Symmetry: D2
């Protein structure tokens, strides 16, 4: 599953529909990023630029011009064909091929952007520009507008109104098309396969980074070359560090390992967390905490649907957590009083859910305290966890346990679809999977 | 093999030895780098900062103060301990532990750098600073010097002399210690294991990126988590693109694949290229070009030694290439006349060798046309290649063949040591390796 | 005559009337400007900031908030009272006194602008800001908007629309109130007195700068402390340099001197040019050129009125010039053909008229080729000139003559009012004035 | 008196003498400065650039190249000849005429600086550059050095050492040549004539700014077109504001007026303060404070000589002030105890003396607490004052009196020469001067 030329074109047209007549929208590619000295990180296109183009080159700018309410057209600035540069660094689309390949009306050399952009903006009323997104883009836009402002004797005029297109575009991205959901479904499947592999490979004595290696290899073999975020493999006390990425420790017999990892497939993020015993068998203490986190996730998966909110479901999870922690002696007191005091916060200190899409922490307005009412087409994670610090003032068998269990879901008319249920999470199913692997 | 605290300390002392009395040297950590939105690439420390510290955190500055010819001391600025930040993002060394851990005299919070740096520079004659390396560092240094310049009524004075420490430091890095050579030797071994695995796994129908996945997994399993540069897997015509990293094509029965890949192990780069038949058997045309590139590499490996130069060895390779290309009818004319015309350049358009170390294209002065006389302790690649474009005006059986064969060597008293000879390169040995794998 | 608090308030309200509901307009003071080292030029407030405040301090920002269509208010950020700073550098209005003095609702310390501005912009739909006017202002505004954009978890939101208020404000400034016209009338009178004095003082042997001194002293004695632009005193060949300000030469018996000078009175510019003989008597050649420029000015003064344009009047002047130059043998050919070829351009190479107000080259849209139809309340200069270069291919008696004659006018319902006719310009009247002075 | 081409050349050679072999010094002109919109302040050349050139154009850079210990040469970058630009804005020296006019070896167009500067710096060991002086200059220098650093394959190398030439140059400026002293002597005479005129013109009812007008006219008529700093005319309570420049009040019968004003003559500053009665007659209270300030100045003028310091002379002034203030009942207690408590500070809160030269607050190291030992050739002001605030807790007849009396001196072998004693300061002489004027 992928997103096709015609869908990128539909998206551009949907933005044009929202624009004022006599306007232009400017969407800039990501800069290349140095890793060290003259070496660069693998290129990651800007998510918004990608959303409107599917074009993976730097030094490119998409310009959508809405001349009036019926007439509009698109211009791409992009790197010119250059034999020497291409022999060295890779093929370039160039100007001749771009209109057909991408479905834009005109293509111009990026090297000419300063000579041409002001001409495209001249006489318009509004420019849509994400000011502050990139320094290089602000320089280009500000230079064009200055030329126009100062150019009255050459009959030039600048648009006086500049509108940030991010809010409009991010609201578009918040609601996925069926084709996007298909891509996210495949991302979920690839990511789940990777997590299953990690559980089947894990043995005491392996290092945390070895599971990262298994995961990344599995992503790759399905055509997801890069993770959507840096893989977390936190064993023992490291599982209490939410974004632990050192992944440097030897995994010990008797510890849990928490793996939070997701692929990037056709631009879209998977995002799964599974926690499991390094030696294949939960201890009683580990199982007691695990059961609370799993009940939280299972209840959330039952509840999420159009018309509820992340805030509402979070309230249900908090009750499950406080109730469970009271039963184990980790919290002491009346459950409702403890809930009123947010007594769970030392142990569950992050949000339950975030949007998912072209970014792992995807764009889109959450509302105050994540109260926005859910509607079909929204995609989000569901990620309860409990983290009992090594020095917590709790019964000592619970100290140093960090557990998170996370699935990705899409809100549907009828509830939600779980995109990542193909990797096990019930403790008996985890143990059975690991027992079978450990016998091989 | 690794580099230890005491070696980082020796390096700092060796820099201090070269500094003027009444001076300070400022070495800044790399900034964290955005991948997309709020997600960052995996952190890569600045190579020079790493060289003097082995410290892998951002927001850190090493200050070496040479008060006079006998007295000197070191101050590290680094992130403070912070419970919330560490629960979220990872452990921090902090100030209390840093002096013992890193072997520096004093540690201060990075948040106090603007309040403290000018005090350390006050009254000194010289500041050593890599101006232009990082914007954030230039802002900090310029602000400190401005405070001092403008502070005469507070009895402050700025050093009037600013010296770029890069030339001195880069000359230090050019000559490896035995411990560095041991780390590079292990990097070479890990990288060679990865290339052997790729040859044993490659089959027609696999995608280029699948070999990247095999390679990266092999790096990981030996504790080299990240490549030293973006892996190149160029099959067929893609092998004629020198830094081809799209790695997107299905590898065809009858094509060669060129793999240029290297690990990063304890900061140091491996860098190997091997080219081999996708189907396990060189065609006659492929073998004819391969033999020329291999003779070039084998001759270079015989020649490299103290007292010669990259330029001198390149001359020998050019003769081998022109002679071989004349024999095949790719070039026509008198060999010496063709050499005088640089007639090989359409087919071999890059350098034979680059320095290798903490960067894959390592630091250090090459001399005009890479004429610097080689001495023991220098580490470099040896990478002849021939690239016959699909539209080259040559006998048609050679079109679209790209071959490079690259090893990493250290110059020794007695010649060179080849760090990467544990992956095969003779064509009969490649074929035998692949035949054995293909039967499994 | 001056502009009063109540008029500044009316102007602010007139801007608020044009603003969208749920918006804020930000108008920033001018920075102080270094002359050399720690010394600054005399402060000149930004004309737009002045227009809305009459406040002559730096480090001040006017914020007009239109909460909805009935409710609006104003906030000034300005320097705090500070005993030491005021003992040294001058009194400050401060926060307590500002609301009453300036007629604004609230005043806050400029030192708190970054802590407070984002709070004023939070939740608004539109911000009016002159982007690119001042770097320091762009930094403040961009920082506030970034805080709001990144502050969703603190329930902050940024206005997505930014509108340049310059076009609206500059159209306001283009049409003067009766009180503004009264101030400009006084500026015209002061400037005319200064030009009369210069004619009465001028003698062969004085330096050009001596007339500048007379002019500036006369401005000062009427309470116009500063010129509106750098005074031009171009004698002989220097009169052919349009903005000649060196004013360094000894004025010679037999040369003309061209003086272009204007005062700044309560912020508003006068702008007069007079050309006259250094020795009190025009030569025949000087009179011949002078008569053409004077006819051009006199005809323009008859013509300017509502419903014509600068372009239309310029056409009449060009005909007068070409006709006159043909009669003298400076141009050769058919008058209408010469007009069609713009044959006057080597001798009259600037515009006839510019707007006049808080800036000498005042703000406001001219239309293509200065074709905008004139309406009552517009104020403009009328400044024909002829400049015959020392090396011009013309009869030799005309070489090195530069003549410009310029008056300031206001367009009225009934034609125009000449604000600067109190300094003579008819050649016989100039000669009589100078003869009378020279006898004293 | 002026500074000539040969002296500017001597200064350049004296700097070259101090430079390391294999170096270049870069000295940049001042930017032009906006006053409002498209109008600029009158140009003021950078004092250091002026010191080495006497060249009054922007867009100019002096490059002094010391190739080795015997060979050196100079290159000027400056604006090209341009007929249109010169017709509009003034004559330009250009490249052809500059070598002879200024005494430099070569001149190049400023528009070519980026194409040429790196070529001049290539292969040098040291660049002398005033980093942070001007943004535009730092951009040019940093760009050149970056080209060289990155240009090893083009055989380019950057100087690794950058030295601020300000300390060396400012120490040169601190010691005046006889020709400089002659120019400062004329500046002192012009400034004194202006102050005498102000005393002779002052009448109750005139505004403070009227005396500014008289002063500026007198500067002008002697060929000092511009003041060296903004003129202070503080009458009554305004005399207690040290840099009062509003100059807006009507001067009252019974008040003093304090005038601090100085011309700029051939680049050099005069700087005189005189305080005198608006009505020509000191009151008893005014005379009592005046006598203390005058004794302070007269004693300082007796004492200043080689081998003392500003700090030492200040101690003598403090004793005079405390003793005088005790006698009047403004201070109460034991004189030596009061001196130990710095009890004079509420009334004398500034320094006695500053260096004088191309800047009014001239360059040069003062030493801690202005303790540097004076030597012949140093030029400085001597400016005691007493300022009794309107709300001071002192006998009420002294409230609101601000008095400063300031002369300019040069340290000689034999003591000092007073450059400004031609304007009176003894109270009986002030009164006699004003009585004579008031009778006319
Ligand atoms: Cl391009
Ligand atoms: Cl910190
Ligand atoms: Cl403030
Ligand atoms: Cl130029
Ligand atoms: Mn996750
Ligand atoms: Mn997540
Ligand atoms: Mn390689
Ligand atoms: Mn290489
Ligand atoms: Mn004018
Ligand atoms: Mn004008
Ligand atoms: Mn003074
Ligand atoms: Mn002074």
């Amino acid at each position: 599953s992928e997103i096709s030329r015609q869908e990128f074109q539909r998206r551009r047209q949907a933005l044009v529909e929202q624009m004022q007549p006599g306007s232009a929208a400017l969407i800039f590619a990501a800069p290349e990023v140095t890793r060290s000295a003259d070496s660069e990180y693998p290129y990651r296109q800007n998510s918004d630029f990608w959303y409107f183009t599917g074009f993976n080159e730097p030094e490119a700018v998409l310009v959508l011009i809405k001349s009036d309410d019926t007439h509009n057209h698109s211009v791409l600035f992009n790197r010119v064909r250059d034999l020497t540069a291409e022999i060295w660094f890779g093929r370039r689309l160039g100007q001749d091929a771009a209109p057909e390949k991408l479905g834009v009306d005109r293509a111009l050399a990026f090297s000419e952007i300063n000579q041409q952009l002001y001409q495209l903006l001249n006489g318009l009323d509004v420019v849509y520009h994400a000011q502050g997104e990139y320094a290089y883009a602000d320089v280009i836009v500000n230079s064009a507008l200055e030329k126009l402002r100062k150019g009255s004797r050459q009959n030039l005029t600048a648009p006086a109104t500049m509108i940030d297109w991010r809010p409009v575009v991010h609201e578009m991205r918040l609601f996925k098309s069926p084709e996007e959901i298909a891509v996210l479904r495949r991302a979920g499947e690839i990511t789940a396969m990777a997590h299953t592999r990690a559980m089947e490979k894990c043995r005491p004595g392996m290092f945390e980074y070895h599971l990262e290696g298994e995961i990344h290899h599995e992503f790759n073999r399905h055509g997801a070359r890069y993770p959507s975020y840096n893989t977390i493999v936190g064993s023992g006390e490291n599982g209490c560090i939410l974004h632990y990425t050192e992944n440097e420790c030897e995994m010990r017999d008797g510890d849990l390992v928490l793996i939070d990892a997701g692929c990037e497939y056709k631009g879209y993020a998977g995002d799964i967390t599974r926690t499991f015993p390094v030696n294949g068998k939960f201890t009683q203490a580990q199982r007691e905490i695990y059961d609370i986190v799993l009940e939280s996730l299972e209840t959330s998966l039952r509840l999420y649907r159009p018309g509820t909110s992340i805030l509402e479901v979070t309230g249900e999870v908090v009750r499950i957590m406080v109730s469970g922690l009271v039963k184990l002696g980790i919290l002491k007191g009346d459950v409702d009083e403890l809930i009123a005091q947010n007594a769970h916060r030392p142990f569950f200190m992050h949000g339950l859910s975030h949007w998912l899409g072209l970014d792992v922490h995807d764009v889109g307005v959450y509302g105050q305290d994540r109260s926005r009412i859910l509607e079909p087409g929204m995609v989000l994670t569901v990620a309860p966890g409990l983290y009992i610090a090594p020095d917590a003032e709790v019964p000592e068998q619970y100290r140093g346990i960090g557990i998170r269990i996370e699935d990705d879901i899409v809100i549907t008319e009828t509830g939600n679809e779980n995109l990542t249920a193909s990797v096990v999470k019930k403790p008996e199913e985890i143990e059975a999977l690991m027992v079978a692997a450990r016998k091989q």
